[PDB]
Amino acid sequence: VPVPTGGDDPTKVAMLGLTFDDVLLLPAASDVVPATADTSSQLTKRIRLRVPLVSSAMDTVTESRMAIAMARAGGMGVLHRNLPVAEQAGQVETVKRSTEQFPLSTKDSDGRLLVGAAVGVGDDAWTRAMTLVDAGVDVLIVDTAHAHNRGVLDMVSRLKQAVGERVDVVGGNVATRAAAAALVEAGADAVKVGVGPGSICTTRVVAGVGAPQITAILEAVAACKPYGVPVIADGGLQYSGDIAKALAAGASTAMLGSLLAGTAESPGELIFVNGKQFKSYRGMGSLGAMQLVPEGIEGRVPFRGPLGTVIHQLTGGLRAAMGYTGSATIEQLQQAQFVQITAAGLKESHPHDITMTVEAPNYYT
Amino acid sequence: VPVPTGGDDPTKVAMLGLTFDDVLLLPAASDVVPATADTSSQLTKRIRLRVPLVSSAMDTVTESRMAIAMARAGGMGVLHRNLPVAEQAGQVETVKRSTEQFPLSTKDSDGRLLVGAAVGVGDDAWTRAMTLVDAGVDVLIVDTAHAHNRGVLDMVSRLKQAVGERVDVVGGNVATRAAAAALVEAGADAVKVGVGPGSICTTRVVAGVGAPQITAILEAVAACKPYGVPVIADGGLQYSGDIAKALAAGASTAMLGSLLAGTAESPGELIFVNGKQFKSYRGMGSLGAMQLVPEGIEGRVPFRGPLGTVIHQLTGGLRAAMGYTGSATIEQLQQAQFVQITAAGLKESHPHDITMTVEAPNYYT
Amino acid sequence: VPVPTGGDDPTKVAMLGLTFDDVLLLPAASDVVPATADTSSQLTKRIRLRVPLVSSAMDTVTESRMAIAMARAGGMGVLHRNLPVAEQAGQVETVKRSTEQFPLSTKDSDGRLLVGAAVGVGDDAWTRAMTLVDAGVDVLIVDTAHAHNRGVLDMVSRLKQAVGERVDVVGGNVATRAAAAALVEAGADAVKVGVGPGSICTTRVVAGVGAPQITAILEAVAACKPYGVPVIADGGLQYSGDIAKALAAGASTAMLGSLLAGTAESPGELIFVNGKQFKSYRGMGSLGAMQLVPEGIEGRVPFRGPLGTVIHQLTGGLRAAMGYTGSATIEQLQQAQFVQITAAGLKESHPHDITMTVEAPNYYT
Amino acid sequence: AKALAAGASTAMLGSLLAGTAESPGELIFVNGKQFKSYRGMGSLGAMQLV
Ligand SMILES: O=c1[nH]cnc2c1ncn2[C@@H]1O[C@H](COP(=O)(O)O)[C@@H](O)[C@H]1O
Ligand SMILES: O=c1[nH]cnc2c1ncn2[C@@H]1O[C@H](COP(=O)(O)O)[C@@H](O)[C@H]1O
Ligand SMILES: O=c1[nH]cnc2c1ncn2[C@@H]1O[C@H](COP(=O)(O)O)[C@@H](O)[C@H]1O
Ligand SMILES: O=c1[nH]cnc2c1ncn2[C@@H]1O[C@H](COP(=O)(O)O)[C@@H](O)[C@H]1O
Ligand SMILES: [K+]
Ligand SMILES: [K+]
Secondary structure, three states: OOOOOOOOOOOOOOOOOOOHHHEEEOOOOEOOOHHHOOOOEEOOOOOEEOOOEEEOOOOOOOOHHHHHHHHHHOOEEEEOOOOOHHHHHHHHHHHHHOOOOOOOOOEOOOOOEOOEEEEOOOHHHHHHHHHHHHHOOOEEEEOOOOOOOHHHHHHHHHHHHHHOOOOEEEEEEEOOHHHHHHHHHHOOOEEEEOOOOOOOEOHHHHOOOOOOHHHHHHHHHHHHHHHOOOEEEEOOOOOHHHHHHHHHHOOOEEEEOOOOOOEOOOOOOEEEEOOEEEEEEEOOOOHHHHOOOOOEOEEEEEOOEOHHHHHHHHHHHHHHHHHHHOOOOHHHHOOOOEEEEOHHHHHHHOOOOOEEEEOEOOEOO | OOOOOOOOOOOOEEEEEOOHHHEEEOOOOEOOOHHHOOOOEEOOOOOEEOOOEEEOOOOOOOOHHHHHHHHHHOOEOEEOOOOOHHHHHHHHHHHHHOOOOOOOOOEOOOOOEOOEEEEOOOHHHHHHHHHHHHHOOOEEEEOOOOOOEHHHHHHHHHHHHHHOOOOEEEEEEEOOHHHHHHHHHHOOOEEEEOOOOOOOEOHHHHOOEOOOHHHHHHHHHHHHHHHOOOEEEEOOOOOHHHHHHHHHOOOOEEEEOHHHOOEOOOOOOOEEEOOEEEEEEEOOOOHHHHOOOOOEOEEEEEOOEOHHHHHHHHHHHHHHHHHHHOOOOHHHHOOOOEEEEOHHHHHHHOOOOOEEEEOEOOEOO | OOOOOOOOOOOOEEEEEOOHHHEEEOOOOOOOOHHHOOOOEEOOOOOEEOOOEEEOOOOOOOOHHHHHHHHHHOOEOEEOOOOOHHHHHHHHHHHHHOOOOOOOOOEOOOOOEOOEEEEOOOHHHHHHHHHHHHHOOOEEEEOOOOOOEHHHHHHHHHHHHHHOOOOEEEEEEEOOHHHHHHHHHHOOOEEEEOOOOOOOEOHHHHOOEOOOHHHHHHHHHHHHHHHOOOEEEEOOOOOHHHHHHHHHOOOOEEEEOHHHHOEOOOOOOOEEEOOEEEEEEEOOOOHHHHOOOOOEOEEEEEOOEOHHHHHHHHHHHHHHHHHHHOOOOHHHHOOOOEEEOOHHHHHHHOOOOOOOOOOOOOOOO | OHHHHHOOOOOOOOHHHHOOOOOOOOOEEEOOEEEOOOOOOOOOOOOOOO
């Protein structure tokens, strides 16, 4: 009679959550060469990228240099809002103002690099949004930790009613089906997914609130796909296989954090420790970033070098996944099968019982 | 109505995958003494080996010396293809040219040692295949990472059409029932199973594509057994118990990698570090081997000595398993029962809370 | 249509196995003080012990001194058979020949201590059994690794017909319901359960054959309880909680290995290393003991002191469990219920986030 | 050369010749390198007592 996990209510424990490490992609009938796979994906309803990657709107990840590098690499960049409005407008103008070196670069009709800007909620946020629209940004990301709030939905509706025909609107982070449906009703052009899985996040420990990324993406897609609203998986990605898994679950774009923190094109200066090169990386809710219960931490990540090499490694991993699953395009990769694995399967997936003597470019010891 | 793991599609997560560490063999009513067990099994539809083990077609594992030693021990070796065609034909001839020391040695109708050769897919691959068939090879392995490709199936069909009655053709690695069925339709005499579980493989991390080995073997056997096509489990084997589990899942032969890399007959030079002996071991998709998005790593494995001792230890483990399950032959072992175990059972299986003071021959720290 | 774990046969993976670390005992309505709990249980159909613990028939655990100490403490000992027949008969006589100090001591009708002896399978085993019976042993354990063999059943039946009215017969190790039923029908007076879980056993690694101990005990009890044949859980016990769980699963007696190997009454010289004390402990299938594929290891265990202290600690833990479950007797403990835990619950069970400064007498680091 | 210059007519060699192939003793292997045993006539082993 009672639920096997306790109590009398079968809906107290709603579901079982899968993360990236819980699943693998099943090989299928393939006629696709990895080098001929088209990796174009809809970032929003009206924007298409050549490489479905986006830089995180974090103070140690994305600024004008990183935004330019990402737009040239074929993706896009979202500028962080941990700075005054005038400076952010200057960054937007700098990005918009900047031949054959980058065939995959993302540009508008006026031939200038695309860029995105992150805004909060409030009348101050309204002023910032209007200033950034005047500065000519292409997409505004309403950035909130919990986007199922009434205020966030009202802000999204206001922005769409005001500057809808000019810029695109991307909703704050969600983790359920109802939240995604509410964001789509409000009129958001894209839905960003993830609450907890950030590499520097401590929401699941401090507050005990979170959701595994694969299940959250599946639910959000089940809510957004009938209306054609793209999904951006945000946070939790460590390898290119994770990107492939996120895209195969239904997410149209992936937003990268610590994978782009150690690049040269990122803000922040180099740090030397025992002859090794590291760079700082902190969450936007960290104790320093707030300058109060922090919801993030501070740390250092190894230096990685030029952004082009990292983006090419990630794209190569995605192309290999597409070749394995027989996916000509991302839209076909979004219908690939999944297989769940156990902890033993997890340690079988990684290299095992071998003393790695030299690092691979796409896999770090 | 919604799937407990998210979404509305019940087939999005196809199945739960079991690896070697997830299962154990159930003891059964036995009348078999381990010393009198018959370990012979079919490699292809026409070749039967006295010991159901095959060396991997890797440049650090199998060459003429290892192939000759494996053929003498009762198994077989497969020469790799990371070298020019003329040299590979020379290795084939060297093996074929080379009485009571090895009663279990595998020989053809002329009394010459059996040996196999690995080829790719393409026109140069076809030239290599014709050269090797002229050189006198016994089995040709169409060795590809993803064998459900239309080109690989066409290559297998061409090889069977041309030289089908002289040599046998073994298909590339598959991981699903559909791929094994496609290979069987294409005319393959044996199906090789496994995508990901290699000790040096990084496909499941770089691309996020893979499948646990026990489930893959079960599915491929379900596809192949009604048509009498043998199955060769490739990758992931670390102990003799793993070999017994693979053969119990339905596989007719096991292909060994890192277990044969530390032997004397394997190519490579001995390495001394801090009083200990190792040998290099690299995957055929590693950056060192491809000369880029590599799909392998490089490392070192401890030195284990002569091949015959290792083969005897593995065969003793297999005979112990056959005696435990009451299996007179491998075909009777292929119907043994499995019990699924958890991580706590996983640590209980290995020795626990004991300070091992001397290494056993078949269990290494 | 297909099985979720692979293939078309739902009985290929027969069941899910639970070990000691996967379950906990559920508290129930209790009117039992831990001091008034009756810990007596049946060893065989005609022999009742005051303490349901038995020493292992190993050459590093039980000899005359250990057998005498165990019989004095309220349990029993089983003399190993890795020595000539005359020496074993001498050990039996030494135990028999050997007052308020030990009021719980187990004695036969004549007032002499009880002892058990281990015999193999064969004609030499028959001669050894006859010599031991002449020497006056009370219980013969047909000690085999796999007791579902036809020879083991024949030996048990022959011994039961020969000296069944003078001694009791205990069957070798089983792990399935069918094996226990076969042993019971063969006429065994007690059934010993366990294949793999020994702390020095490598069968699950070498042969890949085994069964988790809780599930094996449950199956064997389901086979044996209707006929009133007791069950002895052998191997895998590390704490008094494990003893309580084993008895609650249906086992009537527990056989202890490494928990008694480091005591003062165990054979062997005390070994000093780094200012601390250890004693040798090796499996009967280890290469050192066999003097050929080994299925055991050698090692050292920390010195623990007199046997009486260890037995008192174990009995205190068992009495605490009996008080928690409200079990006046062991037969009432054999009906307590279990709760299945996960890995997180497993690490919650042990002490966590605390630096232990002094070792508790019953909980060891 | 220095010893002969000081006035010595002949030099007697010890460890300079111990490792040669013509010296008695079994060749020993350590870390893949080759070494040979050398001990003094007053060593504890050679005596077989300060
Ligand atoms: O301080 C923080 N707390 C919680 N989430 C954060 C914080 N800073 C950034 N995030 C989010 O977590 C993601 C981390 O990305 P990752 O490093 O790729 O996992 C970012 O892209 C943001 O969406
Ligand atoms: O670089 C590589 N990537 C992926 N698979 C590989 C690579 N090199 C070899 N393999 C396969 O993986 C297997 C590994 O076997 P193992 O060393 O026994 O785990 C080999 O026998 C090959 O079939
Ligand atoms: O070499 C061996 N291999 C396998 N089982 C063994 C061996 N020696 C003893 N055993 C059994 O395994 C048990 C181990 O007890 P434990 O150390 O308390 O787990 C012994 O009591 C025997 O029943
Ligand atoms: O045990 C010993 N103690 C002291 N001198 C020794 C001993 N054995 C040999 N010698 C002398 O020391 C010399 C060592 O030569 P060297 O190896 O060139 O230094 C020998 O040639 C002997 O003359
Ligand atoms: K792997
Ligand atoms: K064990």
